[PDB]
Amino acid sequence: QFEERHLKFLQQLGKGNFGSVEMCRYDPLQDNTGEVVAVKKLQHSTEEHLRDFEREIEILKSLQHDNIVKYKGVCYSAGRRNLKLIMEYLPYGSLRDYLQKHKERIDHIKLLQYTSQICKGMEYLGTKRYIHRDLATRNILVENENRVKIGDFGLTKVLPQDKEYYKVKEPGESPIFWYAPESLTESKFSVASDVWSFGVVLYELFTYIEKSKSPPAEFMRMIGNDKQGQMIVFHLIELLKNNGRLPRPDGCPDEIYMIMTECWNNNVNQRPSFRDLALRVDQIRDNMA
Ligand SMILES: Cc1cnc(Nc2cc(F)c(C3CCN(C)CC3)c(F)c2)nc1Nc1ccc(F)c(NS(=O)(=O)C(C)(C)C)c1
């Protein structure tokens, strides 16, 4: 589909784990008429990561939604190595950086517009029995001032056809400050744990990515910055077990923070669905307008 001899590297957009995303121009005619695309590749083409990356490509290719980053194709060299994922390029970057830049022009109604778009994108994943796991403002991309998209699926897993959860323990850094408690203790990931993580995403939006108010900062100040390594996740477990939650962001209405706290239910079954979340957000957004 996309030949590597026509992918012109422009700049690197982001580097997480275990791959990176590059801004490239696919210009096969060699006349600056091609489009700028986003190319995701691996940093170490191991067989374990290559198998996960191929399943990630199939997941994204199976997704067609206004709030999901569009899949365009793949690219590979001689063989199955150097495999790359070709996606659409969204100009305004991640919602984490975009909100932090225009924080003086993005009111609460605009935050609820992005919130509904995230819920409708997550609910579409739930119909496919996909568990995103890694939902955060760093993963939500901005196409323009009126549309955001879920921009990465490197941790997304398909649920077993007979279970509603998915147990997985991946070696490496885990965003434990977005994870549901059952994901920290039992490595259990479900649609309900995505609801917990969405509540953290809702917390991020209303903090406007103030670095002192970040979920890791607030959680670490609650358990004490003196905690060390494994004792960090253990005190976070004990804190969440005792209804220790992130504070209400500055200027956040009471009803918006309730959505966060209700998503932050220790009882996995008592967390609301994304369709109910979209309803309550659209209901508040209409009452504001
Ligand atoms: C699939 C995709 C499509 N379009 C874009 N557009 C975009 C991304 C930018 F960053 C930026 C800038 C770059 C410079 N600085 C200052 C920030 C803003 C920009 F102008 C446009 N980006 C994508 N991917 C992507 C990229 C970079 C990440 F950091 C992440 N984050 S990530 O998913 O968690 C992962 C890397 C997988 C761990 C995803």
mmCIF file of C-alpha atoms in Angstrom, residues 26-281:
data_model
loop_
_atom_site.group_PDB
_atom_site.id
_atom_site.type_symbol
_atom_site.label_atom_id
_atom_site.label_comp_id
_atom_site.label_asym_id
_atom_site.label_seq_id
_atom_site.Cartn_x
_atom_site.Cartn_y
_atom_site.Cartn_z
ATOM 1 C CA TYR A 26 3.873 10.313 1.603
ATOM 2 C CA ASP A 27 4.943 11.867 -1.712
ATOM 3 C CA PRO A 28 5.229 9.033 -4.258
ATOM 4 C CA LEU A 29 5.116 11.423 -7.227
ATOM 5 C CA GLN A 30 8.107 13.284 -5.705
ATOM 6 C CA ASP A 31 6.540 16.699 -6.338
ATOM 7 C CA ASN A 32 5.244 17.858 -2.908
ATOM 8 C CA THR A 33 1.678 16.894 -3.806
ATOM 9 C CA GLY A 34 1.299 14.035 -1.332
ATOM 10 C CA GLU A 35 -0.397 14.233 2.031
ATOM 11 C CA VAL A 36 1.129 14.555 5.489
ATOM 12 C CA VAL A 37 0.422 11.346 7.408
ATOM 13 C CA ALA A 38 1.247 9.993 10.865
ATOM 14 C CA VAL A 39 3.561 6.966 10.832
ATOM 15 C CA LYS A 40 3.754 4.748 13.920
ATOM 16 C CA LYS A 41 6.564 2.201 14.182
ATOM 17 C CA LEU A 42 8.312 0.120 16.826
ATOM 18 C CA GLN A 43 11.592 1.048 18.499
ATOM 19 C CA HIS A 44 12.661 -2.604 18.878
ATOM 20 C CA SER A 45 11.147 -4.990 16.313
ATOM 21 C CA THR A 46 10.861 -7.960 18.649
ATOM 22 C CA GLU A 47 8.541 -10.838 17.819
ATOM 23 C CA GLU A 48 6.413 -10.197 20.917
ATOM 24 C CA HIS A 49 5.935 -6.503 20.108
ATOM 25 C CA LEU A 50 5.482 -7.247 16.396
ATOM 26 C CA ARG A 51 2.591 -9.608 17.160
ATOM 27 C CA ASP A 52 0.968 -7.036 19.452
ATOM 28 C CA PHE A 53 1.535 -4.308 16.853
ATOM 29 C CA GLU A 54 -0.117 -6.390 14.123
ATOM 30 C CA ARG A 55 -3.172 -6.974 16.312
ATOM 31 C CA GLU A 56 -3.236 -3.238 17.066
ATOM 32 C CA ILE A 57 -3.339 -2.520 13.322
ATOM 33 C CA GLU A 58 -6.272 -4.906 12.865
ATOM 34 C CA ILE A 59 -8.112 -3.277 15.778
ATOM 35 C CA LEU A 60 -7.704 0.223 14.335
ATOM 36 C CA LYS A 61 -8.561 -0.964 10.818
ATOM 37 C CA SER A 62 -11.771 -2.438 12.263
ATOM 38 C CA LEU A 63 -12.733 0.972 13.716
ATOM 39 C CA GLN A 64 -14.680 3.613 11.763
ATOM 40 C CA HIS A 65 -15.946 6.473 13.932
ATOM 41 C CA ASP A 66 -15.789 10.266 13.881
ATOM 42 C CA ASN A 67 -13.981 10.177 17.255
ATOM 43 C CA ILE A 68 -11.416 7.506 16.295
ATOM 44 C CA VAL A 69 -8.206 8.367 14.451
ATOM 45 C CA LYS A 70 -8.569 7.225 10.856
ATOM 46 C CA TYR A 71 -6.538 4.262 9.639
ATOM 47 C CA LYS A 72 -4.945 4.780 6.222
ATOM 48 C CA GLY A 73 -2.720 1.761 5.623
ATOM 49 C CA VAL A 74 0.517 -0.025 6.453
ATOM 50 C CA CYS A 75 4.104 0.019 5.219
ATOM 51 C CA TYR A 76 6.905 -2.532 5.419
ATOM 52 C CA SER A 77 10.344 -3.170 3.942
ATOM 53 C CA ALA A 78 11.637 -6.469 2.525
ATOM 54 C CA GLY A 79 9.833 -8.955 4.764
ATOM 55 C CA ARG A 80 7.553 -8.528 7.758
ATOM 56 C CA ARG A 81 10.064 -6.436 9.727
ATOM 57 C CA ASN A 82 10.173 -2.623 9.820
ATOM 58 C CA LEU A 83 6.368 -2.721 9.840
ATOM 59 C CA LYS A 84 4.750 0.713 10.136
ATOM 60 C CA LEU A 85 1.191 1.921 10.734
ATOM 61 C CA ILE A 86 -0.054 4.770 8.529
ATOM 62 C CA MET A 87 -2.738 6.996 10.058
ATOM 63 C CA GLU A 88 -4.209 10.411 9.400
ATOM 64 C CA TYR A 89 -2.280 13.398 10.754
ATOM 65 C CA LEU A 90 -4.240 15.595 13.178
ATOM 66 C CA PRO A 91 -2.725 19.081 13.254
ATOM 67 C CA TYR A 92 -3.438 20.232 16.815
ATOM 68 C CA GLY A 93 -1.695 17.356 18.594
ATOM 69 C CA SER A 94 -2.963 15.654 21.723
ATOM 70 C CA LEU A 95 -5.738 17.116 23.853
ATOM 71 C CA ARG A 96 -3.233 17.338 26.724
ATOM 72 C CA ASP A 97 -1.085 19.872 24.867
ATOM 73 C CA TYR A 98 -3.969 21.576 23.049
ATOM 74 C CA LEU A 99 -5.963 22.257 26.221
ATOM 75 C CA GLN A 100 -2.844 23.538 27.991
ATOM 76 C CA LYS A 101 -2.156 26.006 25.165
ATOM 77 C CA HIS A 102 -5.628 27.514 24.626
ATOM 78 C CA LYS A 103 -6.715 27.175 28.272
ATOM 79 C CA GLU A 104 -7.861 30.822 28.280
ATOM 80 C CA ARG A 105 -10.284 30.320 25.361
ATOM 81 C CA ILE A 106 -11.690 26.851 26.184
ATOM 82 C CA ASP A 107 -14.701 27.300 28.471
ATOM 83 C CA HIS A 108 -16.627 24.564 30.285
ATOM 84 C CA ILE A 109 -19.145 23.986 27.475
ATOM 85 C CA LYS A 110 -16.220 23.250 25.151
ATOM 86 C CA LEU A 111 -14.871 20.760 27.701
ATOM 87 C CA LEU A 112 -18.241 18.986 27.711
ATOM 88 C CA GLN A 113 -18.247 18.871 23.905
ATOM 89 C CA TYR A 114 -14.948 16.988 23.994
ATOM 90 C CA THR A 115 -16.268 14.879 26.875
ATOM 91 C CA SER A 116 -19.269 13.687 24.851
ATOM 92 C CA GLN A 117 -17.042 12.947 21.855
ATOM 93 C CA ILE A 118 -14.824 10.797 24.084
ATOM 94 C CA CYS A 119 -17.813 8.926 25.538
ATOM 95 C CA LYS A 120 -19.259 8.259 22.084
ATOM 96 C CA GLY A 121 -15.851 7.015 20.958
ATOM 97 C CA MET A 122 -15.454 4.732 23.971
ATOM 98 C CA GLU A 123 -18.995 3.370 23.622
ATOM 99 C CA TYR A 124 -18.134 2.474 20.023
ATOM 100 C CA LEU A 125 -15.152 0.520 21.359
ATOM 101 C CA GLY A 126 -17.418 -1.274 23.826
ATOM 102 C CA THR A 127 -19.661 -2.498 21.021
ATOM 103 C CA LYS A 128 -16.587 -4.077 19.401
ATOM 104 C CA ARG A 129 -15.718 -5.598 22.818
ATOM 105 C CA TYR A 130 -12.496 -3.554 22.806
ATOM 106 C CA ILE A 131 -10.888 -2.411 26.072
ATOM 107 C CA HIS A 132 -8.770 0.695 25.494
ATOM 108 C CA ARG A 133 -7.007 0.546 28.902
ATOM 109 C CA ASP A 134 -4.805 3.553 28.131
ATOM 110 C CA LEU A 135 -7.345 6.390 28.016
ATOM 111 C CA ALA A 136 -5.781 9.782 28.779
ATOM 112 C CA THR A 137 -5.607 13.295 27.357
ATOM 113 C CA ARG A 138 -2.172 12.443 25.942
ATOM 114 C CA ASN A 139 -3.944 9.781 23.832
ATOM 115 C CA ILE A 140 -6.879 11.975 22.740
ATOM 116 C CA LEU A 141 -5.917 13.901 19.605
ATOM 117 C CA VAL A 142 -7.394 17.130 18.252
ATOM 118 C CA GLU A 143 -8.392 17.364 14.594
ATOM 119 C CA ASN A 144 -9.833 20.873 14.998
ATOM 120 C CA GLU A 145 -11.463 23.080 17.624
ATOM 121 C CA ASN A 146 -14.730 21.107 17.359
ATOM 122 C CA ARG A 147 -13.609 17.462 17.024
ATOM 123 C CA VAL A 148 -11.300 15.210 19.041
ATOM 124 C CA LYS A 149 -10.341 11.601 18.382
ATOM 125 C CA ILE A 150 -8.954 8.685 20.357
ATOM 126 C CA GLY A 151 -5.499 8.570 18.851
ATOM 127 C CA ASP A 152 -3.782 5.412 20.066
ATOM 128 C CA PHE A 153 -4.691 1.761 20.558
ATOM 129 C CA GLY A 154 -1.341 0.216 21.510
ATOM 130 C CA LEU A 155 -2.800 -1.226 24.727
ATOM 131 C CA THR A 156 -6.282 -2.033 23.407
ATOM 132 C CA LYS A 157 -7.243 -5.687 23.864
ATOM 133 C CA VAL A 158 -10.231 -7.661 22.595
ATOM 134 C CA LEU A 159 -12.344 -9.238 25.321
ATOM 135 C CA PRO A 160 -12.621 -13.038 25.411
ATOM 136 C CA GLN A 161 -15.971 -14.082 23.991
ATOM 137 C CA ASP A 162 -17.009 -15.676 27.319
ATOM 138 C CA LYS A 163 -15.712 -13.118 29.859
ATOM 139 C CA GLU A 164 -16.391 -9.431 30.437
ATOM 140 C CA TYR A 165 -12.880 -8.684 31.680
ATOM 141 C CA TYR A 166 -9.344 -9.175 30.400
ATOM 142 C CA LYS A 167 -6.439 -10.088 32.677
ATOM 143 C CA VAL A 168 -3.038 -8.843 31.509
ATOM 144 C CA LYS A 169 0.185 -7.918 33.317
ATOM 145 C CA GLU A 170 2.545 -6.128 30.937
ATOM 146 C CA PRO A 171 6.185 -5.617 31.965
ATOM 147 C CA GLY A 172 7.192 -1.967 32.005
ATOM 148 C CA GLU A 173 5.787 1.341 33.159
ATOM 149 C CA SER A 174 2.020 1.291 33.695
ATOM 150 C CA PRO A 175 -0.071 4.487 34.049
ATOM 151 C CA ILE A 176 -1.242 3.446 37.509
ATOM 152 C CA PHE A 177 -2.791 6.866 38.192
ATOM 153 C CA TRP A 178 -5.417 6.247 35.494
ATOM 154 C CA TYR A 179 -6.060 2.573 36.358
ATOM 155 C CA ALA A 180 -9.091 1.253 38.207
ATOM 156 C CA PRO A 181 -8.329 -0.395 41.575
ATOM 157 C CA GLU A 182 -9.174 -3.877 40.274
ATOM 158 C CA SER A 183 -6.649 -3.255 37.482
ATOM 159 C CA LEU A 184 -3.954 -2.513 40.073
ATOM 160 C CA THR A 185 -4.703 -5.496 42.331
ATOM 161 C CA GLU A 186 -5.949 -8.170 39.909
ATOM 162 C CA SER A 187 -4.642 -6.884 36.542
ATOM 163 C CA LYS A 188 -8.306 -6.943 35.485
ATOM 164 C CA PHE A 189 -9.325 -4.663 32.599
ATOM 165 C CA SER A 190 -12.912 -4.155 31.434
ATOM 166 C CA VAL A 191 -15.308 -1.552 30.061
ATOM 167 C CA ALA A 192 -15.934 -0.593 33.690
ATOM 168 C CA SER A 193 -12.226 0.064 34.241
ATOM 169 C CA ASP A 194 -12.244 2.263 31.131
ATOM 170 C CA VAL A 195 -15.029 4.188 32.890
ATOM 171 C CA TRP A 196 -12.736 4.730 35.881
ATOM 172 C CA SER A 197 -9.976 5.959 33.567
ATOM 173 C CA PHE A 198 -12.454 8.198 31.741
ATOM 174 C CA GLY A 199 -13.284 9.839 35.064
ATOM 175 C CA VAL A 200 -9.589 10.677 35.328
ATOM 176 C CA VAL A 201 -9.730 12.089 31.791
ATOM 177 C CA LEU A 202 -12.694 14.194 32.903
ATOM 178 C CA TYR A 203 -10.533 15.333 35.816
ATOM 179 C CA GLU A 204 -7.713 16.300 33.446
ATOM 180 C CA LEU A 205 -9.953 18.494 31.280
ATOM 181 C CA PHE A 206 -11.210 20.583 34.204
ATOM 182 C CA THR A 207 -7.704 21.038 35.603
ATOM 183 C CA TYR A 208 -6.683 22.396 32.158
ATOM 184 C CA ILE A 209 -3.512 20.295 32.485
ATOM 185 C CA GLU A 210 -2.104 22.322 35.360
ATOM 186 C CA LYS A 211 1.065 20.394 36.154
ATOM 187 C CA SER A 212 0.617 20.731 39.923
ATOM 188 C CA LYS A 213 -2.959 19.420 39.556
ATOM 189 C CA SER A 214 -2.098 16.340 37.487
ATOM 190 C CA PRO A 215 -3.452 12.942 38.615
ATOM 191 C CA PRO A 216 0.080 11.685 39.392
ATOM 192 C CA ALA A 217 0.898 14.863 41.330
ATOM 193 C CA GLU A 218 -2.336 14.945 43.336
ATOM 194 C CA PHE A 219 -2.157 11.212 44.088
ATOM 195 C CA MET A 220 1.517 11.399 45.091
ATOM 196 C CA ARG A 221 0.860 14.364 47.386
ATOM 197 C CA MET A 222 -1.901 12.301 49.025
ATOM 198 C CA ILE A 223 0.218 9.179 49.610
ATOM 199 C CA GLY A 224 3.377 11.213 50.239
ATOM 200 C CA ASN A 225 6.218 11.869 47.802
ATOM 201 C CA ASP A 226 8.505 9.892 50.145
ATOM 202 C CA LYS A 227 7.065 6.621 48.808
ATOM 203 C CA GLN A 228 9.475 4.395 46.899
ATOM 204 C CA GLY A 229 8.970 2.138 43.883
ATOM 205 C CA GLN A 230 6.589 -0.706 44.688
ATOM 206 C CA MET A 231 5.404 1.122 47.816
ATOM 207 C CA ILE A 232 3.896 3.747 45.492
ATOM 208 C CA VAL A 233 1.348 1.377 43.958
ATOM 209 C CA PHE A 234 0.671 -0.239 47.343
ATOM 210 C CA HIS A 235 -0.201 3.057 49.041
ATOM 211 C CA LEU A 236 -2.279 4.019 46.001
ATOM 212 C CA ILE A 237 -4.210 0.763 46.439
ATOM 213 C CA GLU A 238 -4.760 1.453 50.137
ATOM 214 C CA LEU A 239 -5.739 5.064 49.390
ATOM 215 C CA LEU A 240 -8.312 4.120 46.743
ATOM 216 C CA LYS A 241 -9.691 1.407 49.034
ATOM 217 C CA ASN A 242 -10.441 4.139 51.604
ATOM 218 C CA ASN A 243 -12.325 6.320 49.074
ATOM 219 C CA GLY A 244 -9.284 8.532 48.568
ATOM 220 C CA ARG A 245 -10.057 10.415 45.363
ATOM 221 C CA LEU A 246 -8.711 13.256 43.277
ATOM 222 C CA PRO A 247 -10.024 16.658 44.430
ATOM 223 C CA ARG A 248 -12.631 18.684 42.593
ATOM 224 C CA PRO A 249 -10.742 20.784 40.008
ATOM 225 C CA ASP A 250 -10.829 24.547 40.415
ATOM 226 C CA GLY A 251 -13.994 25.966 38.879
ATOM 227 C CA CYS A 252 -15.519 22.526 38.300
ATOM 228 C CA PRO A 253 -19.286 22.441 38.971
ATOM 229 C CA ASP A 254 -20.516 20.007 41.599
ATOM 230 C CA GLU A 255 -22.471 17.905 39.100
ATOM 231 C CA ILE A 256 -19.397 17.462 36.887
ATOM 232 C CA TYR A 257 -17.311 16.240 39.831
ATOM 233 C CA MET A 258 -20.048 13.753 40.745
ATOM 234 C CA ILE A 259 -19.616 12.160 37.313
ATOM 235 C CA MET A 260 -15.923 11.767 38.158
ATOM 236 C CA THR A 261 -16.623 10.270 41.586
ATOM 237 C CA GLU A 262 -19.353 7.955 40.273
ATOM 238 C CA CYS A 263 -16.912 6.747 37.629
ATOM 239 C CA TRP A 264 -14.486 6.390 40.567
ATOM 240 C CA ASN A 265 -16.660 3.755 42.252
ATOM 241 C CA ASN A 266 -14.747 0.929 43.915
ATOM 242 C CA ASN A 267 -17.697 -1.330 43.047
ATOM 243 C CA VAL A 268 -16.897 -2.323 39.461
ATOM 244 C CA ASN A 269 -20.563 -2.991 38.650
ATOM 245 C CA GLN A 270 -21.895 0.303 40.052
ATOM 246 C CA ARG A 271 -19.941 2.430 37.591
ATOM 247 C CA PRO A 272 -22.094 4.112 34.924
ATOM 248 C CA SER A 273 -22.050 3.157 31.263
ATOM 249 C CA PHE A 274 -20.632 5.355 28.522
ATOM 250 C CA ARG A 275 -24.126 5.818 27.077
ATOM 251 C CA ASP A 276 -25.324 7.134 30.440
ATOM 252 C CA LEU A 277 -22.180 9.260 30.743
ATOM 253 C CA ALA A 278 -22.860 10.779 27.317
ATOM 254 C CA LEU A 279 -26.476 11.438 28.342
ATOM 255 C CA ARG A 280 -25.560 13.227 31.571
ATOM 256 C CA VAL A 281 -22.853 15.283 29.848
#
